[PDB]
Design a protein around this ligand. Structure first.
Ligand SMILES: Nc1ncnc2c1ncn2[C@@H]1O[C@H](COP(=O)(O)OP(=O)(O)OP(=O)(O)O)[C@@H](O)[C@H]1O
Ligand SMILES: [Ca+2]
Length: 382
């Protein structure tokens, strides 16, 4: 039956069917045996490992289980009856791209297989073949400039500053305020707090000065045990670490300066195209206000001559996935699959034209439950 699209991330696995407009199932990319959402909910009695760190696979035994979980537990199909399209981080080592192929063909017996660079799919999802993509997930952030469907590898930038860091940071400035967030389970509550209440300030110092004597800044959050806590300027302080990573002790450049530094590694003739085709994807780019701040920061850095236009669609959390769904539905793409045999032995205009409104409506099942107070306490005893 239909082709499958699996986007494996550092924190989250996104799976579904080519032609649908959204992943079928999204679940944490974790093993404790139990995988993902079921491991999540039993983390009280379990030790959890994340097989993908910074977007590169580090444990193929664990990686295999997640795919097993995707096929048989989540999507509930025979993997031998469905071509699979996978995604990979840029600069993924050939050893890994080979191992990925091996397991797909030899372990799960897929009829066809293909693997794509994530940022590229996000560009496709946005209906472009030339642009610069800012792809920030849980474990890694990438800046990937792309021209006529090909990445310019010399100018691909990577910072190890992403959602993981922002979570740990938020947890760190919340601990300073007196909240006892000390376990891995409580860390997930802080992730949720981040996703719900955090935002990026247009002007950080102005807003910071205003926060000190305002009550508008304050928001309430209910913990699992039922205690309500109140979040103040931590709301915009934690995401500020994307733009000034020094507050994390990282001597990295912010996501604004790294985007600029990337473009400037490109030919002058090309830059004008990149600047007016900036695409943001990934979950970390979901903060309210991040696009307007990106717009402002880049404008103030760019030549006055070039206009800055940034694409940040509502669904950009699952852009990479949507890119795969569109890609795998293209007529000219069918000629590109790797066949089970082919392994035993060894277009540009369609993207622009593709009508996303014809992709089938899909309700994403996000399975990533938050821990009970029992589980938090279970973990406390360690
Ligand atoms: N609305 C939101 N606001 C802020 N952060 C969010 C939001 N939604 C998700 N996140 C964060 O985004 C991250 C997950 O994003 P995403 O699924 O794009 O990355 P991934 O593919 O799992 O990881 P990677 O790209 O590192 O492999 C998590 O850190 C999560 O807490
Ligand atoms: Ca990702």
């Amino acid at each position: 039956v239909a082709a499958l699209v699996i986007d494996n991330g550092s924190g989250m696995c996104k799976a579904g069917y080519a032609g649908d407009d959204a992943p079928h199932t999204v679940f944490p990319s974790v093993v404790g045996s139990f995988v993902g959402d079921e491991a999540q909910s039993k983390r009280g009695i379990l030790t959890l490992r994340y097989p993908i760190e910074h977007g590169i696979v580090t444990n193929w035994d664990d990686m295999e289980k997640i795919w097993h979980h995707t096929f048989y537990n989540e999507l509930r199909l025979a993997p031998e009856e469905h071509p699979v399209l996978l995604t990979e981080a840029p600069m993924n080592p050939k050893s890994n791209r080979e191992k990925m192929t091996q397991i797909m063909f030899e372990t799960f017996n897929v009829p066809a297989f293909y693997v794509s660079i994530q940022a590229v799919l996000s560009l496709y999802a946005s209906g472009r073949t030339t642009g610069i993509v800012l792809d920030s997930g849980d474990g890694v952030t990438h800046v990937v400039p792309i021209y006529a469907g090909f990445s310019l590898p010399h100018a691909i930038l990577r910072i190890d500053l992403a959602g993981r860091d922002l979570t740990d940071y938020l947890m760190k400035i919340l601990s300073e305020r007196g909240y006892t967030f000390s376990t891995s389970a409580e860390r997930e509550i802080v992730r949720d707090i981040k996703e719900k209440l955090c935002y990026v300030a247009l002007d950080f110092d102005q807003e910071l000065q205003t926060s000190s004597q305002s009550s508008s800044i304050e928001k309430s959050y209910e913990l699992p045990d039922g205690q309500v806590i109140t979040i103040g300027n931590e709301r915009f302080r934690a995401p500020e670490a994307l733009f000034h990573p020094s507050v994390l002790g990282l001597e990295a450049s912010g996501i604004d300066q790294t985007t600029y530094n990337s473009i400037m590694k490109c030919d002058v003739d090309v830059r004008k195209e990149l600047y007016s085709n900036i695409v943001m994807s990934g979950g970390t780019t979901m903060f309210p206000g991040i696009a307007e701040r990106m717009q402002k920061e880049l404008t103030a850095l760019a030549p006055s001559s070039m206009k800055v236009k940034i694409s940040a669609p509502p669904e950009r959390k699952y852009s990479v996935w949507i890119g795969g769904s569109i890609l795998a539905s293209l007529g000219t793409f069918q000629q590109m699959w790797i066949s089970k045999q082919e392994y035993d032995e060894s277009d540009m205009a369609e993207i622009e034209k593709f009508d996303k409104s014809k992709l089938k409506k899909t309700e994403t099942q996000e399975k990533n439950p938050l821990p009970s107070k029992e589980t938090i306490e279970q973990e406390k005893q360690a």
